[PDB]
Amino acid sequence: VYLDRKLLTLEDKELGSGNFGTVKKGYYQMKKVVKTVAVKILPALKDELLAEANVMQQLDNPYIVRMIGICEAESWMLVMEMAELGPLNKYLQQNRHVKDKNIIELVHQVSMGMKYLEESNFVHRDLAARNVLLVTQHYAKISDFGLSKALRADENYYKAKWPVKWYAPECINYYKFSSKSDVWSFGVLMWEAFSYGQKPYRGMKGSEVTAMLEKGERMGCPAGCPREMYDLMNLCWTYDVENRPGFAAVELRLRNYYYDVVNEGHH
Ligand SMILES: CC(C)NC(=O)c1c[nH]c2ncc(-c3nn(C)c4cc(Cl)ccc34)nc12
Numbered sequence: 148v149y150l151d152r153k154l155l156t157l158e159d160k161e162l163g164s165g166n167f168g169t170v171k172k173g174y175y176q177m178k179k180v181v182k183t184v185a186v187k188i189l190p191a192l193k194d195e196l197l198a199e200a201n202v203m204q205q206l207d208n209p210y211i212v213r214m215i216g217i218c219e220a221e222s223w224m225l226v227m228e229m230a231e232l233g234p235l236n237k238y239l240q241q242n243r244h245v246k247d248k249n250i251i252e253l254v255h256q257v258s259m260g261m262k263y264l265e266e267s268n269f270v271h272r273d274l275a276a277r278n279v280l281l282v283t284q285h286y287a288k289i290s291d292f293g294l295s296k297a298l299r300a301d302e303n304y305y306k307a308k309w310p311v312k313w314y315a316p317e318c319i320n321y322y323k324f325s326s327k328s329d330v331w332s333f334g335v336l337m338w339e340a341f342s343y344g345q346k347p348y349r350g351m352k353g354s355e356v357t358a359m360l361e362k363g364e365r366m367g368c369p370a371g372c373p374r375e376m377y378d379l380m381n382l383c384w385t386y387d388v389e390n391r392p393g394f395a396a397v398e399l400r401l402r403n404y405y406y407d408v409v410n411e412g413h414h
Contacts, residue, residue, distance in 0.1 A: 148204065150175070150216040150226060157186060163234070166273060166293030167195050168225070175215060175226060184215055187225035195293065196223050202269065202292045203227070210260030212280060212290040230288055232281030236344035239276075243343055245284070247373060248412065250340050251405045253279070253287045258398040260289040261333060265326040265394045268298040270305055272324050274332035275313050276339035296324065304328075311353040312346075316360060317388050327388045330397060334383025341372040360386070375404050 154176040162170045162185065173186040189196060203214035203225075215226040232238055235253065239245060257279055264271060272294035280290045296305040307322040315331035317323045335347050347366060348356050365384050368377040379400055385391035 148216050150218040152218055152220045155184075155186075155218060155224075155226065157188075165278075165291040167192060167199065172229070173226065182215070183229045183231075185227045185229045187227065189222040193223055196225055199293050199295070200225050202295045202297065205297070206264070206267065206269070206292075208260055208263040210256045210288055211263070212288045227290070228282075228288070230280035230282045230290070232283065234277050235279035235281060235287065236276035236339055238281050238344070239340065240344035245343075247341070247371060247376075248405075248408050249284065251373075251376065251401070251408060252285060253281075254337050254340050255398070255401040255405050256287045257289060257336065258333065258394060258401050260287075261326075261329060262394040262398045264289075265329070268326075270296050270298060270324050270326060271329050271332070272296060272305075273310060273313070274329050274336055275310060276336050276344060279336070298325075312348050312351075312356055315388070315391075316386055319357060325388065326393060327391045330383050330391055330394060333394075333397065334380045335366075337376065337380045337383070338366055338369060341376060342369040345369075373404075373408075379404075 156174045158172045160172065162172060164170065165187065168187045168189045170185050170187050173184045175182045175184050187196065200214060200217050206213070212230065213228045215228065218224040218226060261271070261274070271289070271292070273291055274289070278289065278291040280288050282288060298305060304323045304325040307324065311319065313332045313335045315328040318328050338347055339345065351359070365381060368374070379397070382392060383397065
């Protein structure tokens with residue numbers, strides 16, 4: 148878990164910043180090879196990075212960014228897998244000819260990572276297009292576990308600046324965060340993906356979003372988004388938590404629609 152500083156080389160350039168700290172490109176001398184890595188660099192801020200590291204340590208899934216380890220040098224450092232193509236929202240903003248089939252493939256991979264997280268009883272709490280990283284145009288990984296929580300063995304929810312536009316009604320009204328609240332967030336992520344990285348609830352403040360939702364109103368279908376995918380978004384935005392689907396059901400819907408588009412592409 149603890150890494151050797153002399154085996155680690157950092158670039159002086161920055162990539163971007165998450166909930167806590169800033170991320171830089173680096174290189175780690177492995178047993179034989181050299182591994183390109185992304186490195187998160189920074190009293191309270193120290194403990195949140197360690198907690199984040201603690202969370203990532205426990206996670207083992209292809210559609211989640213794996214932690215390589217941690218290192219204490221000039222600052223505390225969180226060394227992670229590199230995803231060269233960067234954040235999904237920025238990628239789609241810059242690559243507008245990405246096909247809907249490709250988008251379906253990527254959001255499905257996110258749903259697989261989240262199915263795993265749910266099965267592991269972790270809540271992400273910041274699930275948005277900005278935190279989906281592209282290893283390739285056809286390979287997405289979930290990142291930024293800065294707000295993530297391991298659920299207590301006796302509880303289905305964690306009780307707490309927030310990304311309000313991604314948060315379910317129960318998060319806003321009761322400060323309660325569950326896998327179902329991650330499902331709500333996943334719906335906004337889908338909307339972002341099919342809108343090619345557009346910001347949700349454009350030009351609205353948190354209070355106006357709340358008023359919209361309590362009127363039963365939801366963001367419209369993005370141009371060119373398949374009706375089946377818009378329907379799934381809306382289902383993720385089920386107001387009542389008990390009637391909102393879990394990731395197991397979400398992933399299956401996505402898996403099935405993807406194969407349907409794949410095999411119809413052969414027709
Ligand atoms: C910061 C948080 C989410 N990022 C991470 O936790 C990352 C973990 N592995 C990564 N690999 C690449 C990038 C990245 N590549 N490029 C080109 C970026 C541009 C921006 Cl603006 C942000 C991150 C990246 N970010 C991460």
